[PDB]
Amino acid sequence: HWGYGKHNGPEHWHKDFPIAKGERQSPVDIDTHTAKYDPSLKPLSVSYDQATSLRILNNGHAFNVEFDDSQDKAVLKGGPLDGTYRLIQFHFHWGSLDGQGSEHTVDKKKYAAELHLVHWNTKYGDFGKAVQQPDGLAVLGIFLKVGSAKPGLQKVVDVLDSIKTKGKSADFTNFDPRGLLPESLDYWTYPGSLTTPPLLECVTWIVLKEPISVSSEQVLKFRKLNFNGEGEPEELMVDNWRPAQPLKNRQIKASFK
Numbered sequence: 414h415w416g417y418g419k420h421n422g423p424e425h426w427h428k429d430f431p432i433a434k435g436e437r438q439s440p441v442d443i444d445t446h447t448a449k450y451d452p453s454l455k456p457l458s459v460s461y462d463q464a465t466s467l468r469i470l471n472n473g474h475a476f477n478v479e480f481d482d483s484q485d486k487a488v489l490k491g492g493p494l495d496g497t498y499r500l501i502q503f504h505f506h507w508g509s510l511d512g513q514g515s516e517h518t519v520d521k522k523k524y525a526a527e528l529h530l531v532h533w534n535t536k537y538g539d540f541g542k543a544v545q546q547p548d549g550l551a552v553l554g555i556f557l558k559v560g561s562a563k564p565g566l567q568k569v570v571d572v573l574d575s576i577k578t579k580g581k582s583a584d585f586t587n588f589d590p591r592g593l594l595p596e597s598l599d600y601w602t603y604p605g606s607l608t609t610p611p612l613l614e615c616v617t618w619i620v621l622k623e624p625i626s627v628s629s630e631q632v633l634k635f636r637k638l639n640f641n642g643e644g645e646p647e648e649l650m651v652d653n654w655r656p657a658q659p660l661k662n663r664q665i666k667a668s669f670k
């Protein structure tokens with residue numbers, strides 16, 4: 414029942430998830446001038462060619478596209494990562510207005526939305542064991558701004574009508590996540606946490622500098638989703654983002670310049 418309302422939102426989370434006030438919480442504001450280029454970073458490798466999407470689900474907080482991670486298919490490697498991280502699902506965070514919606518911010522700038530591609534470290538066997546490790550997860554974050562439509566996102570947009578309410582799912586096979594990436598893989602990276610309860614601090618965040626553009630019509634359809642379940646009073650699924658948290662002396666590294 415945690416959520417993003419005044420009575421169950423981010424300001425209430427710490428009561429049931431004390432780690433909310435931890436030393437490595439996400440998201441964070443990325444101060445571009447303080448971020449330092451890191452020559453030790455290896456080339457980032459996004460290998461999504463064999464990705465196998467399975468289903469899309471409205472979980473009452475956002476919608477999630479799940480993938481078959483039983484085998485080494487869609488993986489993320491390189492960059493700040495040691496080993497291989499398998500893609501398990503992706504989801505978005507968005508606002509009720511174009512001027513807000515992203516979780517991470519850049520020089521305090523809020524984007525209209527933010528895409529999160531969640532991966533787990535294969536050395537830990539499964540996602541559950543991975544979230545018990547300081548380097549168990551890697552989330553690739555991509556900012557969304559409103560402008561031209563993103564063709565590779567339309568398939569997702571058109572299926573949202575079938576998963577309007579919490580608990581609803583639908584078959585979503587053969588979706589290629591590569592169509593959601595921008596041209597450049599320039600990124601910022603830092604150690605953080607899940608941005609929703611349980612807020613576990615097991616994530617290596619990789620946030621791309623170049624945002625992707627989506628049309629106003631596409632994001633408007635994100636905003637037609639419901640936080641509520643079928644047969645309940647409608648509460649539009651908007652502003653499902655957690656604000657920036659204290660950096661706490663962590664350092665944000667840049668893969669460029």
Ligand SMILES: COc1cc2c(cc1OS(N)(=O)=O)CC[C@@H]1[C@@H]2CC[C@]2(C)[C@@H](OS(N)(=O)=O)CC[C@@H]12
Nearest residue numbers: 470472476477478479501502504539540541542544
């Ligand atoms: C409790 O620990 C786990 C959670 C999840 C998985 C494996 C887990 O480890 S376990 N039980 O030891 O195998 C495998 C599937 C995962 C799910 C957690 C919730 C996920 C990430 C879903 O995202 S959601 N619906 O937004 O919460 C999509 C796939 C789900």
Ligand SMILES: COc1cc2c(cc1OS(N)(=O)=O)CC[C@@H]1[C@@H]2CC[C@]2(C)[C@@H](OS(N)(=O)=O)CC[C@@H]12
Nearest residue numbers: 474504529530531541544552606607608609610611
């Ligand atoms: C510990 O395993 C879980 C993780 C998550 C959920 C349920 C889980 O199982 S359990 N035992 O019921 O707590 C439900 C919400 C999920 C979260 C894992 C991180 C997710 C996928 C978040 O991803 S993010 N924003 O990149 O951190 C969005 C929803 C989050």
Ligand SMILES: [Cl-]
Nearest residue numbers: 417418419648
């Ligand atoms: Cl509300």
Ligand SMILES: [Zn+2]
Nearest residue numbers: 504506529608
């Ligand atoms: Zn997220």
